[PDB]
Enzyme design. Sequence first.
Site, PDB file in Angstrom:
ATOM      1  CG  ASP A  66      -0.375  -0.107   2.527  1.00 23.49           C
ATOM      2  OD1 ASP A  66       0.852   0.247   2.665  1.00 23.49           O
ATOM      3  OD2 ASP A  66      -1.136  -0.419   3.511  1.00 23.49           O
ATOM      4  NE  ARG A  84      -0.815   3.104   4.333  1.00 28.43           N
ATOM      5  CZ  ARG A  84      -2.009   2.512   4.284  1.00 28.43           C
ATOM      6  NH1 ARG A  84      -2.743   2.576   3.206  1.00 28.43           N
ATOM      7  NH2 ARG A  84      -2.424   1.851   5.344  1.00 28.43           N
ATOM      8  CG  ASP A 111      -3.656  -1.800   7.019  1.00 25.25           C
ATOM      9  OD1 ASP A 111      -2.597  -1.260   6.687  1.00 25.25           O
ATOM     10  OD2 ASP A 111      -3.885  -2.388   8.086  1.00 25.25           O
ATOM     11  CB  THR A 112      -1.297  -4.141   2.061  1.00 25.60           C
ATOM     12  OG1 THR A 112      -0.351  -3.084   2.202  1.00 25.60           O
ATOM     13  CG2 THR A 112      -2.071  -3.991   0.777  1.00 25.60           C
ATOM     14  CD  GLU A 162       3.234  -2.738   7.710  1.00 25.52           C
ATOM     15  OE1 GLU A 162       4.263  -2.468   7.051  1.00 25.52           O
ATOM     16  OE2 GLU A 162       2.222  -1.944   7.787  1.00 25.52           O
ATOM     17  NE  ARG A 208       2.645   6.996   5.048  1.00 25.07           N
ATOM     18  CZ  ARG A 208       2.113   5.923   5.610  1.00 25.07           C
ATOM     19  NH1 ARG A 208       2.635   4.714   5.380  1.00 25.07           N
ATOM     20  NH2 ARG A 208       1.020   6.003   6.332  1.00 25.07           N
TER      21      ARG A 208
HETATM   22  C1  LIG Z   1      -4.066   5.539   5.067  1.00 26.22           C
HETATM   23  C2  LIG Z   1      -3.831   6.665   6.066  1.00 26.22           C
HETATM   24  C3  LIG Z   1      -2.897   6.488   7.040  1.00 26.22           C
HETATM   25  N1  LIG Z   1      -2.591   7.394   7.949  1.00 26.22           N
HETATM   26  C4  LIG Z   1      -1.685   7.199   9.082  1.00 26.22           C
HETATM   27  C5  LIG Z   1      -2.493   6.557  10.207  1.00 26.22           C
HETATM   28  C6  LIG Z   1      -1.547   5.577  10.858  1.00 26.22           C
HETATM   29  O1  LIG Z   1      -0.873   6.274  11.941  1.00 26.22           O
HETATM   30  P1  LIG Z   1       0.088   5.383  12.903  1.00 26.22           P
HETATM   31  O2  LIG Z   1       1.403   5.291  12.166  1.00 26.22           O
HETATM   32  O3  LIG Z   1       0.163   6.350  14.058  1.00 26.22           O
HETATM   33  O4  LIG Z   1      -0.555   4.099  13.162  1.00 26.22           O
HETATM   34  C7  LIG Z   1      -0.625   5.208   9.714  1.00 26.22           C
HETATM   35  C8  LIG Z   1      -1.072   3.921   9.057  1.00 26.22           C
HETATM   36  O5  LIG Z   1      -0.260   3.712   7.901  1.00 26.22           O
HETATM   37  P2  LIG Z   1       0.458   2.292   7.609  1.00 26.22           P
HETATM   38  O6  LIG Z   1      -0.679   1.336   7.503  1.00 26.22           O
HETATM   39  O7  LIG Z   1       1.141   2.599   6.308  1.00 26.22           O
HETATM   40  O8  LIG Z   1       1.351   1.945   8.782  1.00 26.22           O
HETATM   41  O9  LIG Z   1      -0.718   6.254   8.770  1.00 26.22           O
HETATM   42  C9  LIG Z   1      -3.252   8.644   7.817  1.00 26.22           C
HETATM   43  O10 LIG Z   1      -2.998   9.536   8.688  1.00 26.22           O
HETATM   44  N2  LIG Z   1      -4.130   8.866   6.875  1.00 26.22           N
HETATM   45  C10 LIG Z   1      -4.507   7.955   5.950  1.00 26.22           C
HETATM   46  O11 LIG Z   1      -5.360   8.196   5.093  1.00 26.22           O
HETATM   47 CA   LIG Z   2       0.006  -1.406   5.987  1.00 26.26          CA
END
Ligand SMILES: Cc1cn([C@H]2C[C@H](OP(=O)(O)O)[C@@H](COP(=O)(O)O)O2)c(=O)[nH]c1=O
Ligand SMILES: [Ca+2]
EC number: 3.1.31.1
Length: 129
Positions: free
Chosen positions: A15, A29, A34-35, A37, A75
């Site tokens: 993702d 992103r 959510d994929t 890891e 991102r």
């Molecule tokens: C997809 C997405 C993720 N995020 C943030 C939330 C999560 O915060 P935390 O890092 O505090 O958990 C993290 C999840 O991304 P990943 O799934 O890439 O880890 O990215 C956003 O803020 N907005 C979005 O639209």
């Molecule tokens: Ca992920």
Amino acid sequence: LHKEPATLIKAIDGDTVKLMYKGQPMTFRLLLVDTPEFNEKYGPEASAFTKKMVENAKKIEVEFDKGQRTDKYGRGLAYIYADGKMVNEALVRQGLAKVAYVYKGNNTQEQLLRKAEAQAKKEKLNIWS
Ligand SMILES: Cc1cn([C@H]2C[C@H](OP(=O)(O)O)[C@@H](COP(=O)(O)O)O2)c(=O)[nH]c1=O
Ligand SMILES: [Ca+2]
């Protein structure tokens, strides 16, 4: 919403992808999914899926939603298209991502993605197997 040009710099995982957008390198992103890891079950298969889809594309496009365009890690947040097919939706349809991270104001494609997830679940694909 509208599609804008980008070019692939490099696949990262299920993702996230590195693209050149408006001439600048950015990690995107994928909205609303959510994929797993890479180190988790189906992680590698998601990574490979996205990789193949973006590497094979003639034309990569970025589509931002109405709300926040970058997250707290810098991102880009977008729906990403490969020769007109949405990567975000394709992952969900194959049971390689869950609909997730649905924040108010960047949720335009939510119902399209949920419909994909329901069909993946019916078919008991991958994550739903
Ligand atoms: C997809 C997405 C993720 N995020 C943030 C939330 C999560 O915060 P935390 O890092 O505090 O958990 C993290 C999840 O991304 P990943 O799934 O890439 O880890 O990215 C956003 O803020 N907005 C979005 O639209
Ligand atoms: Ca992920």
